[PDB]
Design a binder for these strands. Structure first.
Ligand SMILES: [Cl-]
Ligand SMILES: [Cl-]
Ligand SMILES: [Cl-]
Ligand SMILES: [Cl-]
Ligand SMILES: [Cl-]
Ligand SMILES: [Mg+2]
Ligand SMILES: [Mg+2]
Ligand SMILES: [Mg+2]
Ligand code: NA
Ligand code: NA
Length: 326
DNA sequence: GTCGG
DNA sequence: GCTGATGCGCA
DNA sequence: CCGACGGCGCATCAGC
C-alpha cells in the first residue's frame, strides 16, 4: 500500500512508546500521524512534504527523511536489538498483560512464553486465559467465520427474548474481510436512559450463550459490558476453530445511535470524531452528544434519530462504516 | 510528539 | 463499604 | 514554550 513503509515505522514506534516507554501521548501522536499519512493520496517524498500534514511535526519529519533516504530507521534498529524492550513489548500481546505488568514480569526474569507457563501462579484469571489462548488470539477471523458467529449469537438472543436487538459492530460492520474479534451491541426495550425495569438483561444473554457452549470463558463482566472468549462448533475429525475474543455491550435503547457509532469505530476515527466535536462545541460518548457549556461542563443530551444526526451536529458529511476504517 | 493557549 | 487512582481494556 | 491531548467499563488497590 501507498506510504506503507512510513506508516509501519510510525506504528512500530507508537507501540514502543506505549508498551516500553509508557509514554501514552507519544503513542497517540504517532498513531495520529500514521493515520493522516495513510489517508494522504500522494507518495510522500520528503519530510518537508509530510510536515505540512496535521499531526506531523519536526521529529516525525526527521524520521521520515531518514527512512526515505535509507530504507530504515536507526532508532528502530536499536529498539529491535534490545532484548529487554522486545520482551516487554512481546508480553503486552497477552490479553490482560499491559505495559506495567509486562515490565514487572520482565524485571523478575519472566521473558518468554515458556517462562509465563512455568509461572502461572503469578497470573490473574484474565492473564491465564490470555496465555491459554495466546496463539488463537493472535489470529484474525475470516469474515466467513464472523457470519457463522453472528448467526449463532442472533439466534440465541432471539430465544431469550424476541425484543432484544443484537448488532455486530467493530471492523465487521465496517466491511472488513477479516476481524480481530467480535463486538456485539445489544439493546432491549426495558433498558433505557429513563430506567431499568428488568434486571440481568446482559446476564440472561451471556448465560444462554454459555449454556450452548458458544461462550467458553469470562474475562470480565458487569451490568453493561461483557468481555470473554467464544468458539464456533467444528465437525468430526476436523481441526477445531480457534477460540476468539468476544465483547458484548448493552446500551440503553434510546441511545442506540451513539452506541453503534462508538462500537463501529475504528478507534482512531472515534477519537478524531470526538476531537472535532470538541472543537465544534460538543462532547460525544457512546450514550449521548451534548453541547459544551461555558463552565466546561456538558449540557443535556441532544435528540438523535440516526448516526447521520451525530455527523450533522458537528458538520461532517456522513461517512458509511466502510469509510471509517484506517 | 504536536500544536495551541 | 466509600472515593479516587491505577491498570487493562473497548471502539 | 509549557502543558493539554476521546471517553468510559470493569477489576483492584490505597487510604480512609
Ligand atoms: Cl507521553
Ligand atoms: Cl527500520
Ligand atoms: Cl460469567
Ligand atoms: Cl442515540
Ligand atoms: Cl452521557
Ligand atoms: Mg473488533
Ligand atoms: Mg473487541
Ligand atoms: Mg482494538
Ligand atoms: Na504538521
Ligand atoms: Na495485553
Amino acid at each position: 500500500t501507498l506510504n506503507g513503509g512510513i506508516t509501519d515505522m510510525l506504528t512500530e514506534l507508537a507501540n514502543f512508546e506505549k508498551n516500553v516507554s509508557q509514554a501514552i501521548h507519544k503513542y497517540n501522536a504517532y498513531r495520529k500521524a500514521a493515520s493522516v499519512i495513510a489517508k494522504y493520496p500522494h507518495k510522500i517524498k520528503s519530510g518537508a512534504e509530510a510536515k505540512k500534514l496535521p499531526g506531523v511535526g519536526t521529529k516525525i519529519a526527521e524520521k521520515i527523511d531518514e527512512f526515505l533516504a535509507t530504507g530504515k530507521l536507526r532508532k528502530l534498529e536499536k529498539i529491535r536489538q534490545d532484548d529487554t524492550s522486545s520482551s516487554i513489548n512481546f508480553l503486552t500481546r497477552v490479553s490482560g498483560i499491559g505495559p506495567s505488568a509486562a515490565r514487572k514480569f520482565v524485571d523478575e526474569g519472566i521473558k518468554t512464553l515458556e517462562d509465563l507457563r512455568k509461572n502461572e501462579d503469578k497470573l490473574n484469571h484474565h492473564q491465564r486465559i490470555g496465555l491459554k489462548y495466546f496463539g488463537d488470539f493472535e489470529k484474525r477471523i475470516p469474515r466467513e467465520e464472523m457470519l457463522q458467529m453472528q448467526d449463532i449469537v442472533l439466534n440465541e438472543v432471539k430465544k431469550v427474548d424476541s425484543e432484544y436487538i443484537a448488532t455486530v459492530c467493530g471492523s465487521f460492520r465496517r466491511g472488513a474481510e477479516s476481524s480481530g474479534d467480535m463486538d456485539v451491541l445489544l439493546t432491549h426495550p426495558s433498558f433505557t436512559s429513563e430506567s431499568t425495569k428488568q434486571p440481568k438483561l446482559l446476564h440472561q444473554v451471556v448465560e444462554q450463550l454459555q449454556k450452548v457452549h458458544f461462550i467458553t470463558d469470562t474475562l470480565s463482566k458487569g451490568e453493561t459490558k461483557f468481555m470473554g472468549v467464544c468458539q464456533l462448533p467444528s465437525k468430526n475429525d476436523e481441526k477445531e476453530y480457534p477460540h476468539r475474543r468476544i465483547d458484548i455491550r448493552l446500551i440503553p435503547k434510546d441511545q442506540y445511535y451513539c452506541g453503534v457509532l462508538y462500537f463501529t469505530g475504528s478507534d482512531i476515527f472515534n477519537k478524531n470524531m470526538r476531537a472535532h466535536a470538541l472543537e465544534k462545541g460538543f462532547t460525544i460518548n457512546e450514550y449521548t452528544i451534548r453541547p459544551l457549556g461555558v463552565t466546561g461542563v456538558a449540557g443535556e443530551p441532544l435528540p438523535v434519530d440516526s448516526e447521520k444526526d451525530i455527523f450533522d451536529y458537528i458538520q461532517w458529511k456522513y461517512r458509511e462504516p466502510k469509510d471509517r476504517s484506517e
